[PDB]
Ligand binder design. Structure first.
Ligand SMILES: Nc1ccccc1CO
Lengths: 212, 1058
């Protein structure tokens, strides 16, 4: 008794091997690739393939991976892990919605730009047809042109606002893009320790073999 | 003393972690960055003369109204005489999707335009085909403008859009083949079970095969109706039924017998059968029983109500679909892949955007690998260079596989990792061949994807092929070896020849071989112990992985496997896809393999069968065997399975697209399942392109789908304002806001004339605002109620009410209800009556959806609050049973208990197997007539075992309450025969599913695509193996189920003959 499916694959998660147990089917199994198993023994055959490779049989097995005083440490490692998982679950939210919000800005910036161009074209459009009517007739005069001046004066100081408005958006894109990086930065720090906090919690529960 | 006086110094009492209850938002509404435009609004009207008159006009004003006033108020400004008549003009502006949209439909309202900035340029109509610039309709239905596609560089995309029309054109042909019938047949496909047989428990309800039906007619003016109650053979057809109605209607004292016969024949085929209260129609030769409305009536103890509708009044409604081709109407001499004599190598260069802490993380590398689902060589890395601070390689990774041994479907999968401190940063995969068969060569830019929630593993082959369309992400570029010529994958003629050669060459190999295993030496004549290990393997499920012996064993006897078609899925997973010898030979078996059942063939479109030949076979199966009934059951899975298809254009898409364009009921759910997932930018392009094809060719239903779409967007904005601005207000105050808004004309317009997306048969008329309300949940779901505007509403339901919920992600519920529905049909068609109520659910968006309201049903909790005595001390176990007796008095009682006990049995077995969220008194429901059903299922395959979890849980635990009811009134009722009867249902129910366990594996397998956290990879699906126990023998399983049912209940389950 004393290396010897679902919980086998979870122990192959991330050379590594182990041996498994219908009896009218086979007997033992070497798990990732599965090999069906004189066998003169179960411990005989495996020691031979630890040093050596599996090429010659078929066109290595390199990695054979306080009764009251470990019990509460199952609650402790779980309660940071489950705190740590929440932190990972929060940030992956923030990361994605910040990615979303970002591109809504990018699309708005494009919309702004197309808005602006129609207006640029509009102040361009009035010059062609207004400065026809400044030079025809002449003696309308100021009751005509100083109202055609008023219209135009609005037309550009509006465009001013629209470009102001676009800039003010563009700056926020940067600050958002900054925060986006920062989130990812910390995501990648939390991740590897989350795995180690998780991996020891498996080992701590596996040695023992639930208020915790 | 409580806390050892330990101060938590960080704890800031104001702010908040979303604890102190609604998930992902927001998408903007009527103007940029404002949900709901102010009732009176100022709009800059840019004229052709360059003038800006700023109108004030109401939020809900039409453009007919804004134009008509603008050409009155423009007069008062200068240059009036440089403007034509208003009728020579059309509005235009920039929308929130950032495109210059011209406004042809002048009846449209200012709020309904999605305007970005509040302004309107005036122009004369350019691009004289007005007609053609109703691609507005298409891009509205789709939720992105069609012009966004016209500007895509990629040739595959533009090739897809041109080549897919082949299909559309063929489909529109079939529709107008024998018109107007075939049109009606498209619009109103017959809603029909796939089996004309009748289970014995239904037949028995009929007194030797006869139903009483009621045919209805309308005369003058279009008001009064008349019944004509027949009693006919269950198995007689609509044309017979129409005759017998007409006979009865027109018998007389003035017509002889012979004279009746003649007046019937002239009338007989002038009419067709409608169902009363909805748009369902019995339009072809089928046993009345085989229509689902009929078979439902029989089970529900009801008397069908049909209507005699005149073919000319039905064909009056069906308009022409009149398909129009859009404006959008390999390479020469190449070198075969098989000529190339080198191993693969790939040059990895320069990741740029990599966001890592240099404190926390030590050093970082790029893992790589070639793949086929599972991989054809040793996985390798580059060295851990310029770690963190500006990561730069210029290596050549060398892959031990010759270039001719690359299978057609081969893919490079890569990922950037960190340091047994191993940890993946970003990922991305490329197809080694392109969509034109071309071996990839040169430099490629590949913008990467973030690791998902569950993904602990480091490389991600199941993840989508292609580069992230989001530019601002880890873009690592690279170089592919180039062989003086555009390399291509060989023709079929070539791959046949290599196979025929490779099999003759095998016959002359001599005697023994060391690990001879992979070839016989046994001869054409094979051992009988061999032939019974093969059919033994054949039976095993998809997830029971095969050993290398069994693989080679299968692979040797590959030719006998043509005896057992059903073995194919296993056979294929034994082929070494890194040996073109083997693979070429496989291509020739698969070429002319015997077609198999559709439920077997759907495995072959999961992520583990990427080959095109294989997937083509599977589609050929579906083309032959899979029926429009059975297709539309599994449609969710067939749309999810598209995501694993290497290239845009393929056989699977062309099939689905055609069925969608051929049968409007499929089309309808085909639209919504694609549309549903348009927010997810893995699939946005693919699904968009597909939705464009569908929308272009589906005819008049587009206009209908636009109304549904227009209605949901209104509701999405409504719930968004309630969940953001009007939180921290009283329900009282919120509900004023709701009513006030629905009253406004634009909402009245948008929410009244349309079809339920949960079922487009149901028309939704005027909404009754008296009965509309915001439910008490924190997600602020809307209870919505519409008149049923059908001619004979009263015969089915006068009011139609369904729930719209902005918060939750509906797609797990959606899937479990599908799985229940399937278990019901499995059971029921084996004569095993267990009555599940798979209520309607539809995801239409990013955590948006629709739930069918089941009337006359109550959460156990309500039952108990209603029947609870005052001086609120303790609730009664019997209260449930009391309430149920109160509903069902007399002979009625015994039948109500039967129902309860039958439904309680199915929902026990169903729920245990699926592992759904723990059941309690506010997610279990009982109807007045005594049927029990679960709601709000939660995470399905046991997703709260990712915390701490082999729990093998029992979610539906039968408290006293239920047991009392199960056994009439008995005391300590574990021991009644009532309950023995019950347990027997549970045992025969458990087993009946266990014999179909493959399908359930496969249905879950095909869903891995969807970004559902509960289904990240196959081990998730491996829960369902333990709980169905497929490693065990059926008698062991029965006991395992008995055992599990015993331990959760504490006593009951150890007496049956298994
Ligand atoms: N062999 C294989 C293939 C696909 C997914 C998972 C596995 C086993 O880890």
């Amino acid at each position: 008794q004393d290396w010897y499916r679902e919980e086998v694959n979870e122990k192959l998660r991330d050379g590594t091997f182990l041996v498994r147990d219908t009896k009218m089917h086979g007997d033992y199994t070497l798990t990732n690739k599965l090999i069906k198993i004189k066998y003169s023994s179960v411990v005989e055959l495996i020691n031979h393939y630890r040093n050596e490779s599996l090429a010659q049989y078929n066109p290595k097995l390199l990695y054979p991976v306080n009764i009251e005083a470990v019990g509460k440490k199952l609650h402790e490692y779980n309660t940071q892990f489950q705190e740590k998982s929440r932190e990972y679950d929060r940030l992956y939210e923030e990361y994605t919605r910040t990615s979303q919000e970002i591109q809504m800005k990018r699309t708005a910036i494009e919309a702004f730009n197309e808005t602006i161009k129609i207006f640029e074209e509009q102040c361009q459009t009035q010059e062609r047809y207004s400065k026809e009517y400044i030079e025809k007739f002449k003696r309308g005069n100021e009751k005509e042109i100083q109202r055609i001046m008023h219209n135009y004066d609005k037309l550009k100081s509006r465009i001013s606002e629209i470009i102001d408005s676009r800039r003010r958006l563009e700056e926020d894109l940067k600050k958002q893009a900054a925060e986006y990086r920062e989130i990812d930065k910390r995501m990648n720090s939390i991740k590897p320790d989350l795995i180690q906090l998780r991996k020891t919690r498996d080992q701590y529960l596996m040695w023992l073999t639930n208020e915790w | 003393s409580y806390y050892h006086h330990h101060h938590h110094h960080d704890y800031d009492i104001p702010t908040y972690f979303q604890g102190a209850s609604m998930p992902p938002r927001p998408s903007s509404g009527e103007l940029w960055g404002i949900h709901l435009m102010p009732p009176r609004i100022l709009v800059e009207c840019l004229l052709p003369n360059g003038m800006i008159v700023t109108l004030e006009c109401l939020r809900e004003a039409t453009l007919i109204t804004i134009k008509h006033e603008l050409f009155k108020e423009a007069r008062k400004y200068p240059l009036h005489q440089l403007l034509q008549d208003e009728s020579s003009y059309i509005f235009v502006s920039v929308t929130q999707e950032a495109e210059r949209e011209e406004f042809f439909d002048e009846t449209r309202r200012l709020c309904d335009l999605r305007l970005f900035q509040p302004f309107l340029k005036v122009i004369e109509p350019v691009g004289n085909r007005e007609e053609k610039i109703l691609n507005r309709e298409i891009g509205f239905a789709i939720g992105m403008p069609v012009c966004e596609f016209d500007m895509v560089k990629d040739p595959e995309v533009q090739d897809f859009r041109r080549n897919i029309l082949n299909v559309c054109k063929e489909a529109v042909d079939l529709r107008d083949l024998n018109s107007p019938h075939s049109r009606a047949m498209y619009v109103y496909p017959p809603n029909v079970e796939s089996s004309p047989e009748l289970p014995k428990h239904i037949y028995n309800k009929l007194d030797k095969g006869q139903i009483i039906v009621v045919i209805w007619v309308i005369v003058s003016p279009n008001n009064d109706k008349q019944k004509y109650t027949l009693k006919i053979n269950h198995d007689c057809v609509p044309e017979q039924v129409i005759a017998e109605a007409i006979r009865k209607k027109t018998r007389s004292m003035l017509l002889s017998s012979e004279q009746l016969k003649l007046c019937v024949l002239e009338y007989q085929g002038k009419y067709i059968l409608k169902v009363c209260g909805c748009d369902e129609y019995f339009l072809e030769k089928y046993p009345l029983s085989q229509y689902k409305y009929i078979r439902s009536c029989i089970m529900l103890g009801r008397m069908p109500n049909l209507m005699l509708m005149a073919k000319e009044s039905l064909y009056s409604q069906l308009p022409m679909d009149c398909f129009t081709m859009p404006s959008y109407s390999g390479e020469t001499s190449t070198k075969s892949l098989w000529v190339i004599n080198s191993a693969l190598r790939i040059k990895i260069l320069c990741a740029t955007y990599v966001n890592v802490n240099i404190r926390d993380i030590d050093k970082i590398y790029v893992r790589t690998g070639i793949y086929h689902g599972g991989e054809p060589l040793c996985d390798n890395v580059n060295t851990q260079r310029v770690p963190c601070s500006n990561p730069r390689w210029n290596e050549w990774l060398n892959y031990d596989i010759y270039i001719p041994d690359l299978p057609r479907a081969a893919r490079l999968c890569l990922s950037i990792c960190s340091v047994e401190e191993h940890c993946p940063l970003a990922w991305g995969n490329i197809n080694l061949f392109d969509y034109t068969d071309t071996l990839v060569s040169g430099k490629m830019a590949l913008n990467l994807w973030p690791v998902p929630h569950g993904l602990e593993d480091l490389l991600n082959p199941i993840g989508v092929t292609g580069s992230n369309p989001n530019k601002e992400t880890p873009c690592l570029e690279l170089e592919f070896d180039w062989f003086s010529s555009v390399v291509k994958f060989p023709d079929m003629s070539v791959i046949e020849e290599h196979a025929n050669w490779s099999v003759s060459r095998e016959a002359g190999f001599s005697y023994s071989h060391a690990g001879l295993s992979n070839r016989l030496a046994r001869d054409n004549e094979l051992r009988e112990n061999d032939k019974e290990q093969l059919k033994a393997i054949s039976t095993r499920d998809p997830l029971s992985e095969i050993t290398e012996q069994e693989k080679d064993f299968l692979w040797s006897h590959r030719h006998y496997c043509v005896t057992i078609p059903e073995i194919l899925p296993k056979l294929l997973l034994s082929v070494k896809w890194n040996s073109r010898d083997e693979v070429a030979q496989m291509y020739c078996l698969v070429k002319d393999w015997p077609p198999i059942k559709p439920e077997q063939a759907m495995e072959l479109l999961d992520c583990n069968y990427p080959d095109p030949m294989v997937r083509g076979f599977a589609v050929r199966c579906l083309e032959k065997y899979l029926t429009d009934d059975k297709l539309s059951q599994y449609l969710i899975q067939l749309v999810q399975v598209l995501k694993y298809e290497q290239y845009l254009d393929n056989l699977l898409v062309r099939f689905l697209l055609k069925k969608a364009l051929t049968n409007q009921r499929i089309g309808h759910f085909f639209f919504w399942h694609l549309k549903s997932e348009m927010h997810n930018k893995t699939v946005s392009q693919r699904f968009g392109l597909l939705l464009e094809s569908y929308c272009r060719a589906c005819g008049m239903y587009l206009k209908h789908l636009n109304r549904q779409v227009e209605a949901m967007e209104k509701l999405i904005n409504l719930t968004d304002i309630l969940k953001q601005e009007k939180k921290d207000e009283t329900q009282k105050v919120q509900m004023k806001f709701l009513v006030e808004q629905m009253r406004r004309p634009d909402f009245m317009d948008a929410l009244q004339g349309f079809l339920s997306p949960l079922n487009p048969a149901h028309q939704l008329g005027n909404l009754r605002l008296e009965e509309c309300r915001i439910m008490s949940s924190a997600k602020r779901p809307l209870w919505l109620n519409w008149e049923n505007p059908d001619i004979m509403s009263e015969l089915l339901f006068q009011n139609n009410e369904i729930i719209f919920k902005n918060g939750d992600d509906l797609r797990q519920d959606m899937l479990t209800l599908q799985i229940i529905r399937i278990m019901e049909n499995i059971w029921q068609n084996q004569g095993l009556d267990l009555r599940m109520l798979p209520y309607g659910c539809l995801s239409i968006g990013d955590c948006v959806g629709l739930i069918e309201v089941v009337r006359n049903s109550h959460t156990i909790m309500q039952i108990q609050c209603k029947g609870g005595l005052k001086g609120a001390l303790q609730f009664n176990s019997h209260t449930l049973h009391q309430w149920l007796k109160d509903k069902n008095k007399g002979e009625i009682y015994d039948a109500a208990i039967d129902l309860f006990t039958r439904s309680c049995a199915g929902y026990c077995v169903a729920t245990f197997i699926l592992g759904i969220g723990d059941r309690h008194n506010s997610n279990i429901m009982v109807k007045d007539d005594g049927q029990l059903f679960h709601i709000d299922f939660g995470h399905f395959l046991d997703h709260k075992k990712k915390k701490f979890g082999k729990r093998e849980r029992v979610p539906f635990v039968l408290t006293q309450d239920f047991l009392i009811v199960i056994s009439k009134g008995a005391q300590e009722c574990t021991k009644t025969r009532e309950f023995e009867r019950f347990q027997e249902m549970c045992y025969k129910a458990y087993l009946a599913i266990r014999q179909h366990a493959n399908l359930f594996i496969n249905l879950f397998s095909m869903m891995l695509g969807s970004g559902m956290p509960e289904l990240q990879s196959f081990d998730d699906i491996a829960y369902i193996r333990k709980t169905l126990a497929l490693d065990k023998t059926e008698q062991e399983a029965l006991e395992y189920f008995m055992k599990q049912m015993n331990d959760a209940h504490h006593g009951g389950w150890t007496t049956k003959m298994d």
